[PDB]
Amino acid sequence: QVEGEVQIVSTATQTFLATCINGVCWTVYHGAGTRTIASPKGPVIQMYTNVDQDLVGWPAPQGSRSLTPCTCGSSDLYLVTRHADVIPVRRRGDSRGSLLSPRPISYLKGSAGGPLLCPAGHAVGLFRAAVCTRGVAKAVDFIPVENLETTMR
Amino acid sequence: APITAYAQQTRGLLGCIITSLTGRDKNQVEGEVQIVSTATQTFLATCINGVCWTVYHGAGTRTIASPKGPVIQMYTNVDQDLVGWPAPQGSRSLTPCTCGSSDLYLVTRHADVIPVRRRGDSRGSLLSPRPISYLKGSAGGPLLCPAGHAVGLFRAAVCTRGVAKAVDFIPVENLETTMR
Amino acid sequence: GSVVIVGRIVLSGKPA
Amino acid sequence: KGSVVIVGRIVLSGKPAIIPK
Ligand SMILES: [C]C([C])([C])[C]([N]C(=O)O[C]1[C][C][C][C]1)C(=O)N1[C][C](OC2=C3[C]=[C][C]=[C]C3=[C][C]=N2)[C][C]1C(=O)[N][C]1[C][C]O[B]12O[C][C]([O])[C]O2
Ligand SMILES: [Mg+2]
Ligand SMILES: [Mg+2]
Ligand SMILES: [Zn+2]
Ligand SMILES: [Zn+2]
Numbered sequence A: 001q002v003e004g005e006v007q008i009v010s011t012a013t014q015t016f017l018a019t020c021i022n023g024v025c026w027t028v029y030h031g032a033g034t035r036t037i038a039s040p041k042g043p044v045i046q047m048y049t050n051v052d053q054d055l056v057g058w059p060a061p062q063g064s065r066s067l068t069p070c071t072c073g074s075s076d077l078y079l080v081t082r083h084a085d086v087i088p089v090r091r092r093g094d095s096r097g098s099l100l101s102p103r104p105i106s107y108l109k110g111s112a113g114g115p116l117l118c119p120a121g122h123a124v125g126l127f128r129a130a131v132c133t134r135g136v137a138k139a140v141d142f143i144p145v146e147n148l149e150t151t152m153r
Numbered sequence B: 001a002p003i004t005a006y007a008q009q010t011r012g013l014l015g016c017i018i019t020s021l022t023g024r025d026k027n028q029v030e031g032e033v034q035i036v037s038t039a040t041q042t043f044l045a046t047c048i049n050g051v052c053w054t055v056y057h058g059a060g061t062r063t064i065a066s067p068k069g070p071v072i073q074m075y076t077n078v079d080q081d082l083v084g085w086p087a088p089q090g091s092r093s094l095t096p097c098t099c100g101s102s103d104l105y106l107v108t109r110h111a112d113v114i115p116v117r118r119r120g121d122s123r124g125s126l127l128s129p130r131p132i133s134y135l136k137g138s139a140g141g142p143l144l145c146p147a148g149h150a151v152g153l154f155r156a157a158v159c160t161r162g163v164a165k166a167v168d169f170i171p172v173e174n175l176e177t178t179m180r
Numbered sequence C: 001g002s003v004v005i006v007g008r009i010v011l012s013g014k015p016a
Numbered sequence D: 001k002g003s004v005v006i007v008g009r010i011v012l013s014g015k016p017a018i019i020p021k
Helices: A145-151 B013-022 B172-179
Strands: A006-010 A015-021 A024-028 A048-050 A055-059 A076-080 A086-091 A096-104 A115-117 A123-133 A136-144 B006-009 B033-037 B042-048 B051-055 B075-077 B082-086 B103-107 B113-118 B123-131 B142-144 B150-160 B163-171 C004-010 D005-011
Touching: A015 A123, A024 A123, A048 A145, A055 A145, A076 A123, A123 A145, A136 A145, B013 D005, B042 B150, B042 D005, B051 B150, B075 B172, B082 B172, B103 B150, B150 B172, B163 B172
Parallel strands: none
Antiparallel strands: A006 A015, A006 C004, A015 A024, A024 A055, A048 A055, A076 A086, A076 A115, A086 A096, A096 A136, A115 A123, A123 A136, B006 D005, B033 B042, B033 D005, B042 B051, B051 B082, B075 B082, B103 B113, B103 B142, B113 B123, B123 B163, B142 B150, B150 B163
């Protein structure tokens, strides 16, 4: 009966992450497409599909719980990867942040859809993509949580 | 950091009552914050520097049940609303904060972490207000700095129409003063 | 094809 | 007057983990 806020997900060709926030399981369009999500009762369709934002949402599955959105406006972020590593990130702009300690790109591979957390553990954004210089991830692009909140409206 | 928290229930109603009267508790202790009960109140106790602290308005002068029978308070300070016992075997202590930061994080009995903006020695405002009944049973729990060190202990809510807008807490400094 | 869930991550580290 | 009793706990020191099967 332990629940997870973060799902590790797969298509036939890719593997990445989804994050539950406010009852919705969110991930990146560039991973999921228009795909349904599996369930023991068969496919479940997307509730939200926003291609401009690279954002997709399904109802939250069984075995999950929702993250609360950040309300503290902090700039100290923490990215969680598919291996459950935590990577500190300083926020630069609305949708960008840079690692405190750059890592090989393979360290972040398959983590798109994962959360960026504030010091409180609340959701600041969804990791969209690694910003790379010669196999080394130095920054991150992310979907700010405000965009999820407005997509729902 | 990031600060995250989970809760586990270790006892039901009946066992609590029986353990309350006997003062003998054989259960294993883990974690930094203990969920605690008397006959009439449930609330929190936070371990800081080898001592398990909580509010006087919940504990009064009571002993704490332990594997060796009841254990007497080491510290009592009615004015400050503060009580302490030696930390139980197996618990883990937080460290007082020395960054002097103004961004705080309150940990509730539900294991949520809620942000708090410091506005004084022993006062802070919620960034998002909460029903008073949400905060109920959280007195004795820690306010943390961004690094997860202890800044204070939740004492009272600033409430209006049943909505808590701010919190009053015992600063760690005052613990040091109560020790002396 | 559907997106399939292959594992889960609990942010607090809560064990079973 | 009864002793105070530990009925549960809150754990802050846990870190993100993959939930085991
Ligand atoms: C009931 C209330 C109106 C919401 C009241 N608010 C209040 O007093 O605010 C003032 C304005 C700012 C400073 C104080 C309040 O939060 N009080 C009232 C009591 O306060 C105190 C004290 C408060 C401050 C200093 C010393 C105190 C000594 C004894 N008791 C216990 C305390 C209380 O009820 N605490 C609850 C908060 C979460 O936990 B709690 O609820 C369940 C209780 O068993 C344990 O305490
Ligand atoms: Mg933790
Ligand atoms: Mg929690
Ligand atoms: Zn936050
Ligand atoms: Zn500190």
